[PDB]
Amino acid sequence: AALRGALSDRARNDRIHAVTELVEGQTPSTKSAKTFLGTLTENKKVLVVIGRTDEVGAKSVRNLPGVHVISPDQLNTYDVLNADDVVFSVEALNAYISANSK
């Protein structure tokens, strides 16, 4: 219930975003991810929720200062409330919705 409360607070303030990929292809690039995240949110702290397999997305955002990366099965109240914005991979968002709402 605490996690749902935190995610609902972001959703009501339109702080939840969904994306197909952080970067295109199989080569990590921090420059691409930084530009793309800049288009999504200008806030400092961002929680990025990615599936286990998306190594290239995780590596691409890892080095950015305010960005925190988590898998959707590890989603927790502290990291949601610490972030200004939550960015979901579509696969990770669907995985979270499925494991809960089913």
């Binding site: 607070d9 972001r10 303030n13 502290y78 409330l81 610490n82």
Partner: protein, 145 residues
């Protein structure tokens, strides 16, 4: 947007601890223990009564024995069966467990306390007499396994 610094405990949730022996403005010096005696430095056992034959020794032991082989039953009243099965139907032990009327692995006896208005086919380990009457009189069956 709610942030970590917005998280507060509920009003009255947290109470400050008492810190004794921290000055005469609070519980200082003797820390609430008064002065001298056994209690100034240790606690007195609850069983102890000063030497007088304690209550737990001057009273007789309760009579009787406990039967190691006792079969105890989980019980359901028919009045609960009414609320749990308004439509009636077949009610076995599995149905009673699913409905929260009994614990899951237990022996079930059915008892007569409530009024039965619904036709029910009840399967349980045992029935009281009044349970027999109420089940049958509403047009249902009482089978004991």
């Amino acid at each position: 947007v709610i942030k970590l610094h917005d998280l507060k405990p509920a009003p009255g949730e947290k109470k400050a601890k008492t810190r004794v022996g921290r000055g005469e403005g609070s519980k200082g010096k003797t820390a609430g223990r008064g002065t001298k005696g056994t209690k100034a430095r240790k606690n007195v056992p609850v069983m102890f009564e000063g030497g007088q034959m304690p209550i737990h020794m001057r009273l007789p032991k309760l009579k009787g024995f406990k039967n190691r082989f006792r079969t105890e039953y989980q019980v359901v009243n028919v009045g609960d069966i009414n609320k749990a099965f308004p439509q009636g139907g077949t009610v076995g032990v599995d149905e009673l467990v699913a409905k929260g009327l009994v614990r899951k692995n237990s022996l079930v006896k059915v008892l007569g306390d409530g009024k039965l208005t619904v036709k029910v086919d009840v399967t349980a380990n045992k029935f009281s007499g009044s349970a027999r009457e109420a089940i049958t009189a509403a047009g249902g069956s009482a089978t004991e396994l």
